[PDB]
Amino acid sequence: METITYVFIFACIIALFFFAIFFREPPRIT
Amino acid sequence: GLPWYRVHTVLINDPGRLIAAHLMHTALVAGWAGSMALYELATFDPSDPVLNPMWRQGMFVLPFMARLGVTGSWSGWSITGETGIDPGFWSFEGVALAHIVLSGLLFLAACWHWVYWDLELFRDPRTGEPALDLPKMFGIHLFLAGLLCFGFGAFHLTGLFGPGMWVSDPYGLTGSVQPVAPEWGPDGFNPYNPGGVVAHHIAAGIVGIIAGLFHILVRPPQRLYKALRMGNIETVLSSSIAAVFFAAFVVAGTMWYGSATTPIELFGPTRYQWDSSYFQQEINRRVQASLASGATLEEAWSAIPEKLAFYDYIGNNPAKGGLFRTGPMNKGDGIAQAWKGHAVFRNKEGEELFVRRMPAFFESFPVILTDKNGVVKADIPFRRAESKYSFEQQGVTVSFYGGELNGQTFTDPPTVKSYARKAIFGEIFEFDTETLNSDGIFRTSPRGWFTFAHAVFALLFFFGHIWHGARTLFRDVFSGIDPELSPEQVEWGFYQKVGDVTTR
Amino acid sequence: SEGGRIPLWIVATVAGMGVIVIVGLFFYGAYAGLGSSL
Amino acid sequence: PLGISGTFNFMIVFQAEHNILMHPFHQLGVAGVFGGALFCAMHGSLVTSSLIRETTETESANYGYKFGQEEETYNIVAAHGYFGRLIFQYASFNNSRSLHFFLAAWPVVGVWFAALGISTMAFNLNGFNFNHSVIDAKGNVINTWADIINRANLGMEVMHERNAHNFPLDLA
Amino acid sequence: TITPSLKGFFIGLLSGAVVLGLTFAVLIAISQIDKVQR
Amino acid sequence: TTGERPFSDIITSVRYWVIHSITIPALFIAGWLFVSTGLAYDVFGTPRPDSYYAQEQRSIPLVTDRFEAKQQVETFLEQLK
Amino acid sequence: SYPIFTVRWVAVHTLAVPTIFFLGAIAAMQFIQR
Amino acid sequence: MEVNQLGLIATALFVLVPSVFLIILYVQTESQQ
Amino acid sequence: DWRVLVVLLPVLLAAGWAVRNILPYAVKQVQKLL
Amino acid sequence: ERGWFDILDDWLKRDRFVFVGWSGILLFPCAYLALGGWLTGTTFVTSWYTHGLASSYLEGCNFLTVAVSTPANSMGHSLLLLWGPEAQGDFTRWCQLGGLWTFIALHGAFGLIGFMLRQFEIARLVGVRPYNAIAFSAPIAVFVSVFLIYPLGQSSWFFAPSFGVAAIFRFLLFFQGFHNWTLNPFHMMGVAGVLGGALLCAIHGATVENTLFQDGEGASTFRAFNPTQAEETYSMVTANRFWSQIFGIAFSNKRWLHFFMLFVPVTGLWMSAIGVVGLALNLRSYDFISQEIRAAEDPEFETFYTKNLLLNEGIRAWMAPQDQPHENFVFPEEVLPRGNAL
Amino acid sequence: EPNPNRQPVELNRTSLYLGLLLILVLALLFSSYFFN
Amino acid sequence: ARRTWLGDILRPLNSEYGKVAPGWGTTPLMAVFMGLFLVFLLIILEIYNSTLILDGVNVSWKAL
Ligand code: CLA
Ligand code: CLA
Ligand code: CLA
Ligand SMILES: CC(C)=CCC/C(C)=C/CC/C(C)=C/CC/C(C)=C/CC/C(C)=C/CC/C(C)=C/CC/C(C)=C/CC/C(C)=C/CC/C(C)=C/CC1=CC(=O)C(C)=C(C)C1=O
Ligand SMILES: CCCCCCCCCCCCCCCC(=O)OC[C@H](COP(=O)(O)OC[C@@H](O)CO)OC(=O)CCCCCCCCCCCCCCC
Ligand SMILES: CC1=C(/C=C/C(C)=C/C=C/C(C)=C/C=C/C=C(C)/C=C/C=C(C)/C=C/C2=C(C)CCCC2(C)C)C(C)(C)CCC1
Ligand SMILES: CC1=C(/C=C/C(C)=C/C=C/C(C)=C/C=C/C=C(C)/C=C/C=C(C)/C=C/C2=C(C)CCCC2(C)C)C(C)(C)CCC1
Ligand SMILES: CCCCCCCCCCCCO[C@@H]1O[C@H](CO)[C@@H](O[C@H]2O[C@H](CO)[C@@H](O)[C@H](O)[C@H]2O)[C@H](O)[C@H]1O
Ligand SMILES: CCCCCCCS[C@@H]1O[C@H](CO)[C@@H](O)[C@H](O)[C@H]1O
Ligand code: OEX
Ligand SMILES: [Cl-]
Ligand SMILES: [Cl-]
Ligand SMILES: [Mg+2]
């Protein structure tokens, strides 16, 4: 149960990395 | 839009919805007290006020009800051990119910004040703008605080019209709720004199009545009004937070060191009673008095109350717990069942030896026995190959006086070493470790948890005071500095007085 | 009297050498007398 | 070790075997990271204190800066004017370039020394040893705080890897 | 009764009052002599 | 600028060095003599190398009472013969 | 042109005067024998 | 291993309640004009 | 105690020597601020 | 109204080399006395009667081993006023009883208050936002929690940190052996804040210096900057593209960047302060109960957690007798925990 | 009877990512102590 | 804005927004009470601390 919890949290973070890099708000110059 | 950390600023200029928000907070806090008390009542075991008092059971709000005179249940028990009592309506259950009902009434009021926010009372009569006259509000509220403070001391604590408060003897053996008369001399400022508590509330209450009337009738000086921004409600938040963290540090300290308002029968012993062998000295004095009066060793020790021996045990020291060791103390060493009696160790020469007690600093401690003069006579060795003081070499035995093992002596090394391991914790008890599946690891008491939460909250509220004080005094630059700031105001020399353009 | 007479670089050099003298004395004392383990 | 408690094990045993706390390169390393965190909050607070008002109070001040804008977003003169008076004028930077260079260099140089401490204690050139350095007139040892550190180090030494030594000197 | 420590308390009070008093005395004095030009 | 005389001005003026070629060594020598006369030991109550212990004792004169600590130190000092 | 006794003068000397006295005291200590 | 079994729901609400808060605020920001 | 006078004497002679070299300007600075 | 208060206000706020202000009435004496007490104590004052230690240059200690040590455990939490009932006005006894320690700690606490009031005071005169004062709340939380709350939870000031280099190292090691402080998640957060702060300091400084605009002709680029210029001196656009392509993400808001630089170390120090408040009560993160149950029953179960506890046990038993002399610990050689051979 | 003090609330996408990362990392740190 | 019976009763109690006393007003009397209060806190602090010891004031549980 606790192993599943640790790995699940870890996996969510790696997923978050993906969206933060590739699905970020684009920086736009003005 | 508003960032997430600012959503509640919409109430700053809306006194009626501010009152609604404050009513909803009060409803939540009252409902917490009612529901916490119900949870404690569903888990509290009232059947042994000697070896299983409330502070061994993780009770947090029960001791605060008992402190001011609520001691009984509608089901017929009291926390001092009486049966067949009738507490009237103000039992633990009646107090919890009263707070639940109050919670619901305040919830309804909050809805009324949220919908009917635009009340003429909140408008300045000259300008029609929302406005609160904070200096006069302060005097009204301080006046009400003074009256309430005074009536608490004069009527509740004295027993004139009320139950009094919890008072005990210096060893926490005979506590009960008693009317308390004020102490008007210098001992009234002794933290351990309950009489000073009564005198404080009568005297500070009167002072608050007077100061309230003053603050209703005398307007603030123009110089203080400008300097403290008394038209800005956020100056009240800043100074209120400062008073609150001041108060929180004080209640954390008196909980840790002890005082007349944090009795040991409600919150458990203090760590300092173990540091100074406070209970061990009273126990010894009583045994001396018996031996001196001709009783035997077995009679002297058997006359020691189990409740007094239980205080002389490091498992009840609130400095022995851990941050993530959760639950009641009973979950650690177990539910105490009986004093085993006082262990006396002797070597082969018949000399009495004394186990060195564990200081609170140490998670573990070696087993070391000295004579009356502190000379090492026996120990439990780590490396056996050059041991000279083993129990086996020194013929160490243990005999018990009083308690359930009264009159017995053990001579086999394994059993003697077993009791010597327990003796570093002070007096030795039998524990039920099965009922709660206790794990054998010490936990802290409500005294420990109260102190930790309130010191942490006090420190955090210091940051709140700094933050809201800064917002009050620097409201004009909250969004940034003036875009037309002259370099001359910040370069050296141009003004004789820093920031004063009239001193060019 | 009037600031300017003694060049700054000579001031800097003389004050530097005094620092080195006094710090060297402290390191000498680590090996002699008190605190030297002897 | 590649773990959190394994890291702590490494540090504790390192202290027993090299007295890293008494090594000046670890001390320079501490100055590096304590200094770096200090100057981090320092730089952040000064620049934040002198943001030019571009927003109303109901919005984040961060919207007052636009990515790629030509003009600076804070008044470094006002920041220098504050910090110069906090200490004295010549203890404060007014050149953003040499300020940011100092921010770069201080933690980097300190961490270089920290890395060189580990690397040179790798070859057993250990921290200062003042064990029994203070002696009285008769020759009694007078303990200093260095000797109390030694007692702690000995407890670490005698317990680490409790089954791995057969001979009295832990030479590696 | 004036215990030794109550005596010591009064000495502490007087000392601090003296220190604060002279401090503000000198300060008020100097501020009156060296005024700013407006 | 804040009006005071520049430091570089002052410390390169002959008058500065006339004054401080005296005041600095005088203070240094006062500090040396504070130690060499042994006055520092007596002001601060610090043991000399021969007064940490009595000749045959090896126990620290540790203070163990709060309100009689002054008398305890005085007693430890007598026992130095 | 400039004053001599300023606040800065006082601040400088409350630090510098004891520093020199202490350095002489610590210099003497290097010759103490046990 | 004899872990505290409340650890599971404690961790799960610790993640879920504040994460859900943030998602609500974000989604209603996108849906504004 | 004579050591108190042995220690203060180098400091006292330093106080008077700097007063000799500075008193013309000191009186002149106090006069201007009046 | 131009009374004496306003004239005093004028003089206190003059633009001089060292600004004074109203805050300076508190700041300057208290800072000066705390610094002077530390230098006086480390040069001349012993710890023989309180700790059994030499601790001054006079006694032969060096810059690493001098300290102003805490008072004897028998003083409890006494204020140890010079005129109080322990020293009774005797300056020499006061020094020998540890009075300089509360002297430094208390004048230091009020000095720190004064420095933060100075940050507020100057900020209000110059017209800047007071975020420098807000950021300084983190050093104050650390000082108060370590030097005041922590010993106040313990038996006496004796267990506070002593003011010295090696004395503070002993404080670190005591916290490992007795409190298992490396295991504490509030310390972990503090470590993250301090190392993350040092990281941010280095990376921002280097990024600026390596995205500079060529605004001059010299090979030394420092000269090509003017405090009053309106333009950014470095390229935020190029900096953003570099980190986006090296690391994946980058800053794009310069106001967020510098706020974050305040936030990270300040929050870290505050978190570490909270954990030390817990240690005041011995409310430690010492153990994982699940690990201890398994390990008690299964003598083949070993982790780095159980290895480190054995080190803590060595620290406690080997340092306690000398480090806590008032306890009179006598631990015969045979009870001392030791591995094989060592 | 519309209250004039109401204000829209915002949370931008970067703040969402930052907030989720803080919460997941805090959970990853504290979970071991919850299980104990 | 909405008038109510209770609001009309309380109206005078919220009608002097911004009214000050000229100048320094009662500030010097305030300062006297603040100083007296500071000495009071010092006394009760030092009693609890056993830095101030008074006859018949025994700061201990043994005072019941
Ligand atoms: C002042 C507040 C306070 C205090 C001192 C107590 C004290 C107690 N409670 Mg009570 N309780 C409280 C409020 C409090 N309670 C509230 C508000 C609730 C409703 C939730 C409860 C509901 C409750 C229940 C249901 C129970 C108790 C029990 C107890 C007892 C055991 C406590 C324990 O194991 O904690 C363990 C404490 C911890 C593990 C500390 C948690 C530390 C947190 C997680 C740190 C979080 C860090 C944060 C994420 C970091 C942010 C960083 C960011 C800002 C950057 C103890 C007597 C137990 C008992 O014995 O009853 C008989 C029990 O069963 N309490
Ligand atoms: C009497 C207490 C009190 C009151 C009536 C206020 C009111 C306010 N604060 Mg202040 N503040 C306080 C105490 C208080 N604060 C304390 C102790 C601190 C230090 C921690 C602060 C630090 C602080 C900062 C840094 C800021 C404020 C801000 C504000 C304003 C907007 C708050 C908001 O929208 O939050 C919205 C919050 C949320 C939507 C979620 C927060 C969830 C928290 C972090 C965890 C959950 C807590 C839990 C539910 C309850 C535990 C209760 C605890 C006391 C036991 C509002 C005027 C803001 C401001 O000035 O705007 C201009 C602002 O930036 N406050
Ligand atoms: C100006 C800032 C300042 C501040 C905030 C402090 C603060 C402190 N000092 Mg420090 N000190 C200072 C300057 C300061 N000092 C200076 C300039 C010197 C050199 C002389 C010292 C030398 C010094 C020594 C030698 C000692 C201290 C000590 C202390 C501590 C106890 C103070 C106390 O109890 O006084 C109480 C006094 C007051 C609060 C004065 C207030 C007076 C009230 C408001 C007016 C009413 C009084 C009335 C007129 C008199 C009635 C008396 C009558 C009944 C007999 C406290 C931390 C003690 C310490 O550190 O303990 C370890 C200590 O031993 N200080
Ligand atoms: C009886 C008595 C005494 C009564 C007193 C009453 C009274 C009124 C007294 C007043 C008279 C008086 C003045 C007496 C003085 C007494 C006296 C000498 C007191 C002294 C106290 C004392 C020595 C305190 C010491 C304090 C101390 C150690 C300060 C150290 C300062 C120091 C080391 C600074 C170096 C650090 C530094 C340069 C950091 C810069 C790095 C950094 C990242 C900057 C960031 C940054 C900088 C910028 O620059 C700008 C631009 C921006 C963008 C930016 O990011
Ligand atoms: C010269 C000796 C330097 C040795 C150590 C290196 C320090 C500088 C490197 C830090 C890297 C930070 C990241 C890059 C940050 C970055 O990009 O830097 C940029 C910065 C400015 O670059 P410029 O192009 O303007 O100048 C460099 C060349 O182009 C020559 O003009 O470089 C320098 O200032 C170099 C300074 C040389 C002189 C420095 C001497 C420092 C010695 C101080 C004594 C230390 C002793 C401490 C004992 C405790
Ligand atoms: C409506 C109504 C009613 C009812 C009412 C009710 C039924 C109520 C209830 C109420 C309630 C039932 C309430 C409750 C509340 C609770 C709360 C409010 C809680 C909170 C909590 C918290 C806040 C916590 C926190 C924490 C955690 C979680 C963890 C640890 C740490 C801390 C502590 C932070 C009646 C009939 C009377 C009448 C009228 C109407
Ligand atoms: C405590 C007390 C007090 C006070 C006192 C004081 C205030 C003092 C001061 C003092 C001082 C104020 C001292 C000082 C000293 C100083 C010193 C001793 C220094 C040294 C230095 C050095 C040695 C240096 C080194 C170096 C470095 C660091 C780096 C760079 C390079 C070099 C190497 C140079 C009173 C009487 C009030 C009261 C009683 C108590
Ligand atoms: C179990 C955990 C759950 C935690 C609970 C979280 C509750 C959070 C509630 C957030 C509510 C936000 O409240 C929401 O604010 C928005 C703007 O922000 C308001 O929206 C308003 O402004 C927008 C913006 O132009 C207009 O287009 C719109 O027509 C108007 O209604 C919504 O009317 C309201 O629904
Ligand atoms: C060898 C086992 C029997 C010898 C006596 C052991 C000490 S006593 C023993 O200690 C247990 C906790 O360790 C308690 O749970 C139990 O109640 C108690 O009887
Ligand atoms: O392996 Mn890991 O640790 Ca470096 O010493 Mn030798 O070895 Mn072991 O002992 Mn100590
Ligand atoms: Cl190991
Ligand atoms: Cl080997
Ligand atoms: Mg030497």
> Domains in chain F, please, with CATH?
5-81 (1.20.5.860)
- Cα–Cα distances (Å) from B341 to B124, B295, D132, L46, in that order, read 75, 17, 48, 41
Phi-psi region of B84 (alpha: psi -120 to 50; beta: other; left: phi over 0): left
Q: Which residues on chain E are in Cβ contact (under 8 Å) with J83?
A: 8-9, 11-12, 15
At residue J47, the 3 state secondary structure works out as strand
Q: Does B88 touch chain F (CB under 8 A)?
A: no
Tokens of B5: 């950390």
Residues β-bridged to residue D141: D135
Angle at B215 between CA B209 and CA B216, to 5 degrees: 90
Given resolution (angstroms):
2.2
**Helix (H) or strand (E) segment spanning residue B342:** strand B335-346
Pairing type for strands B176-178 and B409-410 reads unpaired
Residue J77: which of J154, J2, J156, J138 has the closest Cα? Answer: J156
Q: Which residues on chain F are in Cβ contact (under 8 Å) with D89?
A: 2
Distance CA(B42)–CA(B44), nearest Å, equals 6
- Domain membership of residue L24 (yes or no) is yes
Q: Does B439 touch chain J (CB under 8 A)?
A: yes
CA dihedral B414, B415, B416, B420 (to 10 degrees): 100
Listed in sequence order, the residues at least 6 apart from B156 whose beta carbon sits closer than 8 Å to its beta carbon are B68, B69, B162, B163, B164, B165
Listed in sequence order, the residues at least 6 apart from J224 whose beta carbon sits closer than 8 Å to its beta carbon are D97, J212, J213, J214, J215, J216, J218, J233
Residue D98: which of B206, J225, B182, L21 has the closest Cα? Answer: J225
**Helix (H) or strand (E) segment spanning residue B370:** strand B368-370
Largest CA distance in chain G: 55
Q: Does I33 touch chain E (CB under 8 A)?
A: yes
Evaluate: CB of J206 within 6 angstroms of ligand 5: yes
Distance CA(H7)–CA(G25), nearest Å, equals 62
Measured between CA atoms, the residue of chain I closest to residue F30 is: I7
Q: Which ligand 3 atom sits closest to the C-alpha of E13?
A: 37
Tokens of E18: 């003296």
Distance CA(B415)–CA(H27), nearest Å, equals 68
Evaluate: CB of B410 within 6 angstroms of ligand 9: no
Listed in sequence order, the residues at least 6 apart from E37 whose beta carbon sits closer than 8 Å to its beta carbon are B496, B503
Distance CA(B437)–CA(H5), nearest Å, equals 13
- Chain B positions with Cβ closer than 8 Å to H: 1, 4, 326
Measure H12 CA to nearest chain A CA, in Å.
9
Tokens of I7: 């220690």
Evaluate: CB of J40 within 6 angstroms of ligand 7: yes
CA-closest residue to ligand 8 atom 11: H25
Evaluate: CB of D157 within 6 angstroms of ligand 10: no
**Helix (H) or strand (E) segment spanning residue B401:** strand B397-401
Distance CA(J118)–CA(J130), nearest Å, equals 11
Residue J278: which of J139, J180, J169 has the closest Cα? Answer: J180
- Site to probe by mutation for ligand 6, drawn from B61, B103, B106 as the one with most ligand atoms within 8 Å of Cβ, is B103
Residue D132: which of D151, D107, D113, D119 has the closest Cα? Answer: D151
Task: Count CA within 13 A, CB hemisphere, residue B171.
Answer: 19
CA-closest residue to ligand 1 atom 26: B327
Is B339:B279 a contact under the CB 8 Å cutoff? no
Is F36:I31 a contact under the CB 8 Å cutoff? no
**Helix (H) or strand (E) segment spanning residue J216:** none
Binding site per annotation, positions of J for Fe cation = 204, 258
At residue K9, the 3 state secondary structure works out as strand
Tokens of B336: 């105490």
Distance D146 CA to ligand 10 centre (A): 23
Helical residues (DSSP H) of B174-232, grouped into ranges: 194-217, 222-228
Listed in sequence order, the residues at least 6 apart from B281 whose beta carbon sits closer than 8 Å to its beta carbon are none
CB contact under 8 A, B481 and D80: no
Tokens of K6: 């109401």
Is A19:K17 a contact under the CB 8 Å cutoff? yes
Distance CA(J69)–CA(J41), nearest Å, equals 9
Q: Which amino acid appears at position F71 of this protein?
A: Q
Number of domains in chain J: 1
Evaluate: CB of D12 within 6 angstroms of ligand 10: no
Residue D115: which of D25, D13, D16 has the closest Cα? Answer: D25
Distance CA(B316)–CA(B306), nearest Å, equals 14
Pairing type for strands B335-346 and B176-178 reads unpaired
Number of domains in chain E: 1
Measure E14 CA to nearest chain L CA, in Å.
12
J3 by Cβ neighbours in 10 Å (0-12 / 13-18 / 19+) ranks as exposed
Rounded to 10 deg, the angle between the K13-35 and J185-209 helix axes is 150
Considering only CA atoms, give the Rg of chain A. Answer: 14
Q: Which amino acid appears at position H9 of this protein?
A: I
Evaluate: CB of G19 within 6 angstroms of ligand 7: yes
Distance CA(L7)–CA(F32), nearest Å, equals 81
Measured between CA atoms, the residue of chain A closest to residue D69 is: A30
Pairing type for strands B352-355 and B397-401 reads unpaired
Binding site per annotation, positions of G for heme = 13
Distance CA(D105)–CA(F65), nearest Å, equals 52
Q: Which amino acid appears at position B25 of this protein?
A: H
DSSP state string for H1-33: ----THHHHHHHHHHHHHHHHHHHHHHHHHT--
Is G22:J39 a contact under the CB 8 Å cutoff? yes
Evaluate: CB of H32 within 6 angstroms of ligand 8: yes
Angle at B391 between CA B390 and CA B396, to 5 degrees: 150
For residue B82, how far is the Cα from the chain centroid?
A: 26
Distance CA(L44)–CA(B250), nearest Å, equals 12
Distance J147 CA to ligand 4 centre (A): 23
Distance CA(F46)–CA(H6), nearest Å, equals 58
Sole residue written with tokens 């392509």: J245
DSSP state string for B129-185: SB---HHHHHHHHHHHHHHHHHHIIIIIITSTTS--EEE--TTSSS-EEE------S
Phi, psi of J224 (to 5 degrees): -85, 45
Distance CA(J60)–CA(J57), nearest Å, equals 5
CB contact under 8 A, L53 and E1: no
Is D47:D74 a contact under the CB 8 Å cutoff? yes
Listed in sequence order, the residues at least 6 apart from D143 whose beta carbon sits closer than 8 Å to its beta carbon are D134, J52, J53, J54, J322
Q: Does F55 touch chain D (CB under 8 A)?
A: yes
Ligand 6 proximal residues by C-beta, below 6 Å: B 28, 31-32, 35, 100-101, 103-105, 107
CB contact under 8 A, B478 and D57: yes
Distance CA(C2)–CA(B498), nearest Å, equals 31
CA-closest residue to ligand 7 atom 5: J36
Distance CA(B170)–CA(L61), nearest Å, equals 5
Angle at K33 between CA B461 and CA B325, to 5 degrees: 80
Distance CA(B255)–CA(B272), nearest Å, equals 12
Count other Cβ atoms within 10 Å, centred on residue D108: 17
Phi, psi of B350 (to 5 degrees): 75, 10
Tokens of J258: 């510098």
Distance CA(L53)–CA(J133), nearest Å, equals 40
Count other Cβ atoms within 10 Å, centred on residue J137: 19
Q: Give the mutation candidate from B187, B496, B498 for the E interface (greatest E CB count, under 10 A).
A: B496
Is B21:B11 a contact under the CB 8 Å cutoff? yes
Sole residue written with tokens 């006295």: G21
Number of domains in chain L: 1
Q: Give the mutation candidate from D51, D58, D62 for the B interface (greatest B CB count, under 10 A).
A: D58
Tokens of J268: 């870290």
Measured between CA atoms, the residue of chain B closest to residue J76 is: B272
Count other Cβ atoms within 10 Å, centred on residue J169: 23
CA-closest residue to ligand 8 atom 1: H17
Distance CA(J258)–CA(J135), nearest Å, equals 12
Measure K9 CA to nearest chain A CA, in Å.
19
Is D28:D64 a contact under the CB 8 Å cutoff? no
Count other Cβ atoms within 10 Å, centred on residue B195: 21
Q: A: neighbours with 3+ CB pairs under 8 Å?
A: D, H, J, K
Q: Which residues on chain H are in Cβ contact (under 8 Å) with K28?
A: none
Sole residue written with tokens 């022995």: B320
Which experimental technique did the depositors report for determining this structure? X-ray
Residue J156: which of J69, J248, J241 has the closest Cα? Answer: J69
Is B258:L59 a contact under the CB 8 Å cutoff? no
For chain I, give the residues followed by a break (C–N over 2.5 Å). none
Parent domain of E38: 1-38
Q: G: neighbours with 3+ CB pairs under 8 Å?
A: C, D, F, I, J
For domain B271-448, the CATH architecture is: Roll (3.10)
Residue B276: which of B371, B366, B365, B360 has the closest Cα? Answer: B360
CB contact under 8 A, E31 and J81: no
A25 by Cβ neighbours in 10 Å (0-12 / 13-18 / 19+) ranks as exposed
CB contact under 8 A, J52 and F63: no
Distance CA(B78)–CA(B63), nearest Å, equals 13
Evaluate: CB of D93 within 6 angstroms of ligand 4: yes
Measured between CA atoms, the residue of chain H closest to residue A13 is: H15
CB contact under 8 A, J10 and E35: yes
Tokens of B184: 């008007």
Listed in sequence order, the residues at least 6 apart from B292 whose beta carbon sits closer than 8 Å to its beta carbon are none
- Domain membership of residue L21 (yes or no) is yes
Distance CA(L16)–CA(L4), nearest Å, equals 20
- Site to probe by mutation for ligand 4, drawn from D92, D95, D102 as the one with most ligand atoms within 8 Å of Cβ, is D92
Considering only CA atoms, give the Rg of chain E. Answer: 17
Parent domain of L7: 1-51
**Helix (H) or strand (E) segment spanning residue D76:** helix D76-86
Measured between CA atoms, the residue of chain J closest to residue A30 is: J237
- Domain membership of residue L22 (yes or no) is yes
Q: Which ligand 4 atom sits closest to the C-alpha of J12?
A: 8
